[model samples]
Target: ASETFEFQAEITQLMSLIINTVYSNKEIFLRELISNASDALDKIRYKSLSDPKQLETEPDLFIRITPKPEQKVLEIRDSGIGMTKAELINNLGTIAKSGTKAFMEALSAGADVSMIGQFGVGFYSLFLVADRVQVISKSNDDEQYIWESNAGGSFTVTLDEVNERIGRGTILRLFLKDDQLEYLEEKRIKEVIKKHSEFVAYPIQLVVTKEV
Candidate 1:
C-alpha cells in the first residue's frame, strides 16, 4: 500500500497562525465572509461576460442570509461557481489555489485578505466564532457535499443530496460560538450587512423572524 503525506512543517505553522489570529476581532468574521462571497459573484459575473452559458443553470446569482436562532445557525447561501468534492478538499481543506495566493501576495506580502476574496483564509475565520461550521456546496460538474469543521485540529466531510434550489453555488452555515451569540440579533446582522457588504452587487436579506 502507498500513501501520501503532503503536509510540510511550514504548513503547520501557517495553519496555527491562522487559527490564533482570527480571534482578535470576532464581529468582523461575517463581514469578511460576505466580502469574499461578493468577490465570488464578481468572478462569476466576469465569466458570464465572455461565456453566455454561464447562467444556464445558475440563473439567479445572489446571496441569501438567513439567521436561525432556534437552530443556532446563520446560513449564507449564494448562486455562484460552486465547488466539487475534490475542490472542497484541495481548495478549502489544504492550501488555496495559486491564483488566490498570488492575488493576496500582490496586495501586501503579509497583509491578511480576510476582508477580500483573494485568500482562502476567510473560511478558517468562521471557526474563530463558531462551534461548528457547515459548508453545503453544489458544483456543476459534481454532486453536492457537506463539509463540517469545528477547527478543532481535524475536519469531516460527507455527501449530501444537493439542496433542491442550491443549484450551483455554496451554502455556509455558521453555528455561532456561545460567546458570539449577538450575531443572532436582527439589529446586529443589519449593521454588519450595511457596514461591510453595502457595496456588494447582490441581494442580501435579513429575516427578522422565522415568519418573515
Candidate 2:
C-alpha cells in the first residue's frame, strides 16, 4: 500500500529555503546526488567482496545520466545498494538539526559545498532546478518502491509498481521546473558532470536522444 507522509517542521523549513531563494549554483545539486550514488555503490561493492552473490548478475556498478525532453525527465541512475519501502519513507521523510534555517542561511551566503552533505539536506537542493522528483529503487531484501515529492509539505511512497520495475539499484526521474529547463540539455548536464564529478570513482555514462 502507498502512504503519504507530512514533512517534519525542519523539512518544511528546508523546502522553503529552495522555494523562496533565487539560487544560481544549482549545479551543485548534481554533485551532491552523484556523491550519494557513489556512497551506495561503495557499499554494494564492499559487500560483494565478502560474498560474490552480492553482485551475481553481472552488475557494471556504475552511474548514468539520461536527459530526454520528450519524456520531460533527467534520469540519474545508480547501480548500487537500493532502498526498501521503509528506507525510502524514513530517508526522504524526516529531517533533523541539519535542515534548520542556519544551514540554508549559510547556503545563501556561499556555504562550502562539502557542508552540503554534512547538512543532510543536499537532496532538497534539487528543488532549485526541479519541481518534482521520483526515486525508484529495488533492493535485494525488499520490493521496489517509488518515493516522490513535489517540494511541498508531504511526500508519498508506493510499493513496486507494475509498469516500472528494475532488477536492482536506484534511478531518479527529475521533472524539470519550467524556468530551469537548461538542466534538460545533454550538453549542460555533461558540462556539470565534467566540472563536478570528474573524480568520481565509477564511470558515469550520459545517455542522450538522437537529434534531428
Candidate 3:
C-alpha cells in the first residue's frame, strides 16, 4: 500500500529528465542564450514593420552590456520577442515546446529535431555567473513585466517601477559573484561579446560606470 496524493513516479521521472536532459553541452548554453536574445531582437525588428519607432530610439541589431558599480549590477539588454507571465512560466518553469521526448523521438525516427529550437534550460545557466538576475520585458501585445530570480529557489514577477525601461525590449540585471568581479571591466565584457558573438547581426554595447 502506497500514498498517491502527489506526483506519480513517471511524472517525477519526467521532471528529472526535464532538468537533466534539456541541454547537451555546457558551452552550448552561451550560444543558446545569446540566440534567444537574438531571436527577441529579430521579433522586435519585424514588429517594427508597422511601428518603425518601436526600436528607433536604439536602432541596431546588437546586444548591449552595462556594468553598474553603484548598484553592483551587470546588465545585458536586447530588443526581442518579449514573454508574458504565462509564456515566461511555461517557457521557463518547464519544457513547453519539443523537448527531450521529441528530441529522442526524432533521433529514433531518423528525423532532424536539431533544426527545432529548445529554450527552457539554456537561459537558466545565467545563474552560473550571477547570484541574482532581474528581467525587464515589454511586449507590444501586453503590459510590461519585471521578473527577478535569485536561482536559489523561486522567482518573482511584477510591474515596472517607472525608473526601469527604455523602449520595447528586455534587460537582464545580473548581480555578479564577488570572485567574478573581473567581468565588471569593460574590456573583459567586450572581449566576451567579441569572442562569442562577434557575428551577431545586432549591436552589443557594454555600458559601464566611469570610475571618476
Candidate 4:
C-alpha cells in the first residue's frame, strides 16, 4: 500500500538548484501552485467534454486555501484532475515531463492545451518555504494516494486511508518552516492570490477559522 522511491539521477540536486534560484520572491510559490491547480481544473474540464463518465465523479471545480495555524501547515486544495499512484511517484518524486502533458497527449487533446505545468520544476517552489510537502490526490481512474517529500534524497507515495477524498482533485499541504509560517496568515495568502492569480479562470477561496 506504500512505496519509497529515489529521485531520478539529476533530480535531488536539480530541485535544490531550482528552489534556491528559481523564485526571487517566496510569495511566488503560491502563484506557481495556484496556477498548477488551475491547470488541473482545466485538464478535467477539457477531458470531460469527451469522457463525461470520469468527469461525473467531481464536476465542480475550484481551489481552496486553508491555513491551519495550530498545525503549522498551509494547504492549497483543488477540485480538479487528480493523479494516480504512478503519477504521484513520477510527477512529484522526479523531474519527469508533466503528467498533465502526458494525460492530454494520451487523450489526443485538441490544439493549445496550455496547462502551465510544462516546467517540471514549478512544484519545487514549495521547498523555498516548507521543509516538507504532502500531496493528497484522488483520480477518477485510481485510488487516493499521498505523495510526500522533504526535498531530501527520497520521497514516498502511499495509500490515503485516514482522510476522506472527493472523486478527483489534489490537496497540497506544506509543513512550513518556523520563519516561513507567517504566510499562513489570511492577509498574506489573499495578497498572493490577488497579486499572482487575479486573472485565473477558476475561483480560489480562503477559509478562515472563527476570528479571535
- List the candidates' TM-scores in order: 0.77, 0.89, 0.68, 0.84
Candidate 2 vs candidate 3, TM-score winner? 2
C-alpha local distance difference test of each model: 0.68, 0.79, 0.58, 0.77
Model 1, 77-154: lDDT tens digits are: 888787888777776666643434554454456554354343545665565667677788887778888776655445
What is the total number of backbone clashes in candidate 1? 0
Residue 9 error, candidate 4, Å: 3.1
lDDT of candidate 4 over 1-212, digit per residue (tens) = 66888986455764554445434467767888998899889999988899888777877789989998999999999988899998888677654535434533532553222222354355766777887889999988799999988877788888999767767899999999788887889988888789867788888989998758
Model 3 alpha-carbon drift over 4 Å, by segment: 1-32, 47-61, 96-120
Minimum summed lDDT over a 10-residue window in model 4 is located at 107-116
Ranking by TM-score: 2, 4, 1, 3
lDDT at position 18, candidate 4 = 40
Could you give me the TM-score of model 2 versus the true structure? 0.89
Error of 4 at 167 (Å): 2.5
Cα error, candidate 3, residue 35 (Å): 2.6
Q: Please give, for residues 113-197, the per-residue lDDT of candidate 2 as tens digits.
A: 4466677667777777787899999887788888988878888898765535666788888898777778888888888888877
Question: How far off is residue 122 in model 3, in Å?
Answer: 1.8
